[PDB]
PDB file of all heavy atoms in Angstrom:
ATOM      1  N   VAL B 124      10.718 -10.434  -2.355  1.00  0.00           N
ATOM      2  CA  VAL B 124      10.080  -9.451  -3.229  1.00  0.00           C
ATOM      3  C   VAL B 124      10.630  -8.082  -2.878  1.00  0.00           C
ATOM      4  O   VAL B 124      10.712  -7.739  -1.691  1.00  0.00           O
ATOM      5  CB  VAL B 124       8.541  -9.468  -3.080  1.00  0.00           C
ATOM      6  CG1 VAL B 124       7.907  -8.328  -3.863  1.00  0.00           C
ATOM      7  CG2 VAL B 124       7.982 -10.795  -3.541  1.00  0.00           C
ATOM      8  N   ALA B 125      11.031  -7.311  -3.902  1.00  0.00           N
ATOM      9  CA  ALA B 125      11.503  -5.936  -3.750  1.00  0.00           C
ATOM     10  C   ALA B 125      10.719  -5.017  -4.681  1.00  0.00           C
ATOM     11  O   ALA B 125      10.821  -5.135  -5.906  1.00  0.00           O
ATOM     12  CB  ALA B 125      13.007  -5.820  -4.045  1.00  0.00           C
ATOM     13  N   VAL B 126       9.950  -4.095  -4.111  1.00  0.00           N
ATOM     14  CA  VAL B 126       9.112  -3.184  -4.885  1.00  0.00           C
ATOM     15  C   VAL B 126       9.565  -1.752  -4.618  1.00  0.00           C
ATOM     16  O   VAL B 126       9.762  -1.359  -3.462  1.00  0.00           O
ATOM     17  CB  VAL B 126       7.619  -3.361  -4.533  1.00  0.00           C
ATOM     18  CG1 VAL B 126       6.745  -2.636  -5.557  1.00  0.00           C
ATOM     19  CG2 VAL B 126       7.246  -4.809  -4.490  1.00  0.00           C
ATOM     20  N   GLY B 127       9.729  -0.974  -5.685  1.00  0.00           N
ATOM     21  CA  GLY B 127      10.108   0.421  -5.569  1.00  0.00           C
ATOM     22  C   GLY B 127       8.914   1.330  -5.893  1.00  0.00           C
ATOM     23  O   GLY B 127       8.120   1.021  -6.770  1.00  0.00           O
ATOM     24  N   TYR B 128       8.833   2.446  -5.179  1.00  0.00           N
ATOM     25  CA  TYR B 128       7.696   3.354  -5.264  1.00  0.00           C
ATOM     26  C   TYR B 128       8.216   4.773  -5.386  1.00  0.00           C
ATOM     27  O   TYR B 128       9.159   5.158  -4.687  1.00  0.00           O
ATOM     28  CB  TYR B 128       6.789   3.276  -4.014  1.00  0.00           C
ATOM     29  CG  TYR B 128       6.028   1.978  -3.883  1.00  0.00           C
ATOM     30  CD1 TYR B 128       6.617   0.883  -3.279  1.00  0.00           C
ATOM     31  CD2 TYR B 128       4.738   1.841  -4.366  1.00  0.00           C
ATOM     32  CE1 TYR B 128       5.944  -0.317  -3.156  1.00  0.00           C
ATOM     33  CE2 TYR B 128       4.059   0.643  -4.254  1.00  0.00           C
ATOM     34  CZ  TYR B 128       4.673  -0.435  -3.641  1.00  0.00           C
ATOM     35  OH  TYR B 128       4.027  -1.638  -3.511  1.00  0.00           O
ATOM     36  N   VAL B 129       7.587   5.558  -6.252  1.00  0.00           N
ATOM     37  CA  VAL B 129       7.814   7.000  -6.300  1.00  0.00           C
ATOM     38  C   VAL B 129       6.475   7.683  -6.048  1.00  0.00           C
ATOM     39  O   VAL B 129       5.498   7.407  -6.746  1.00  0.00           O
ATOM     40  CB  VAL B 129       8.426   7.440  -7.646  1.00  0.00           C
ATOM     41  CG1 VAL B 129       8.277   8.946  -7.840  1.00  0.00           C
ATOM     42  CG2 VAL B 129       9.899   7.006  -7.755  1.00  0.00           C
ATOM     43  N   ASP B 130       6.428   8.552  -5.039  1.00  0.00           N
ATOM     44  CA  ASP B 130       5.181   9.209  -4.620  1.00  0.00           C
ATOM     45  C   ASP B 130       4.033   8.214  -4.447  1.00  0.00           C
ATOM     46  O   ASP B 130       2.900   8.457  -4.878  1.00  0.00           O
ATOM     47  CB  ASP B 130       4.785  10.322  -5.595  1.00  0.00           C
ATOM     48  CG  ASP B 130       5.890  11.352  -5.793  1.00  0.00           C
ATOM     49  OD1 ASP B 130       6.835  11.390  -4.979  1.00  0.00           O
ATOM     50  OD2 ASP B 130       5.821  12.125  -6.770  1.00  0.00           O
ATOM     51  N   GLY B 131       4.324   7.075  -3.811  1.00  0.00           N
ATOM     52  CA  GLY B 131       3.294   6.113  -3.474  1.00  0.00           C
ATOM     53  C   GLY B 131       2.833   5.211  -4.598  1.00  0.00           C
ATOM     54  O   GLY B 131       1.925   4.399  -4.384  1.00  0.00           O
ATOM     55  N   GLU B 132       3.414   5.317  -5.784  1.00  0.00           N
ATOM     56  CA  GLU B 132       3.036   4.493  -6.922  1.00  0.00           C
ATOM     57  C   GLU B 132       4.192   3.561  -7.255  1.00  0.00           C
ATOM     58  O   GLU B 132       5.338   4.011  -7.368  1.00  0.00           O
ATOM     59  CB  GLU B 132       2.708   5.353  -8.148  1.00  0.00           C
ATOM     60  CG  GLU B 132       1.331   6.003  -8.201  1.00  0.00           C
ATOM     61  CD  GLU B 132       1.361   7.418  -8.810  1.00  0.00           C
ATOM     62  OE1 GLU B 132       1.246   7.564 -10.060  1.00  0.00           O
ATOM     63  OE2 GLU B 132       1.435   8.394  -8.022  1.00  0.00           O
ATOM     64  N   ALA B 133       3.894   2.270  -7.415  1.00  0.00           N
ATOM     65  CA  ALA B 133       4.936   1.308  -7.752  1.00  0.00           C
ATOM     66  C   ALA B 133       5.558   1.662  -9.093  1.00  0.00           C
ATOM     67  O   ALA B 133       4.838   1.968 -10.048  1.00  0.00           O
ATOM     68  CB  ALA B 133       4.350  -0.106  -7.796  1.00  0.00           C
ATOM     69  N   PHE B 134       6.897   1.619  -9.180  1.00  0.00           N
ATOM     70  CA  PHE B 134       7.556   1.844 -10.469  1.00  0.00           C
ATOM     71  C   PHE B 134       8.540   0.753 -10.880  1.00  0.00           C
ATOM     72  O   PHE B 134       8.834   0.652 -12.082  1.00  0.00           O
ATOM     73  CB  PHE B 134       8.245   3.225 -10.507  1.00  0.00           C
ATOM     74  CG  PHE B 134       9.583   3.289  -9.810  1.00  0.00           C
ATOM     75  CD1 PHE B 134      10.745   3.512 -10.533  1.00  0.00           C
ATOM     76  CD2 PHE B 134       9.669   3.242  -8.428  1.00  0.00           C
ATOM     77  CE1 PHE B 134      11.978   3.609  -9.892  1.00  0.00           C
ATOM     78  CE2 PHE B 134      10.893   3.318  -7.782  1.00  0.00           C
ATOM     79  CZ  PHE B 134      12.046   3.515  -8.517  1.00  0.00           C
ATOM     80  N   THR B 135       9.031  -0.086  -9.956  1.00  0.00           N
ATOM     81  CA  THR B 135       9.850  -1.241 -10.308  1.00  0.00           C
ATOM     82  C   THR B 135       9.473  -2.413  -9.411  1.00  0.00           C
ATOM     83  O   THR B 135       9.068  -2.225  -8.258  1.00  0.00           O
ATOM     84  CB  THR B 135      11.366  -0.953 -10.198  1.00  0.00           C
ATOM     85  OG1 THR B 135      11.737  -0.699  -8.834  1.00  0.00           O
ATOM     86  CG2 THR B 135      11.793   0.231 -11.069  1.00  0.00           C
ATOM     87  N   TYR B 136       9.618  -3.628  -9.939  1.00  0.00           N
ATOM     88  CA  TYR B 136       9.276  -4.826  -9.187  1.00  0.00           C
ATOM     89  C   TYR B 136      10.318  -5.900  -9.472  1.00  0.00           C
ATOM     90  O   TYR B 136      10.731  -6.079 -10.621  1.00  0.00           O
ATOM     91  CB  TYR B 136       7.841  -5.327  -9.529  1.00  0.00           C
ATOM     92  CG  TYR B 136       7.453  -6.651  -8.871  1.00  0.00           C
ATOM     93  CD1 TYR B 136       6.724  -6.680  -7.685  1.00  0.00           C
ATOM     94  CD2 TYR B 136       7.838  -7.865  -9.422  1.00  0.00           C
ATOM     95  CE1 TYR B 136       6.391  -7.899  -7.070  1.00  0.00           C
ATOM     96  CE2 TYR B 136       7.522  -9.061  -8.825  1.00  0.00           C
ATOM     97  CZ  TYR B 136       6.794  -9.074  -7.654  1.00  0.00           C
ATOM     98  OH  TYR B 136       6.499 -10.284  -7.081  1.00  0.00           O
TER      99      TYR B 136
END
Side-chain angles (χ1 to χ4, degrees):
Chain B
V124 173
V126 193
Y128 291 85
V129 163
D130 305 344
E132 280 142 88
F134 80 114
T135 65
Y136 175 96

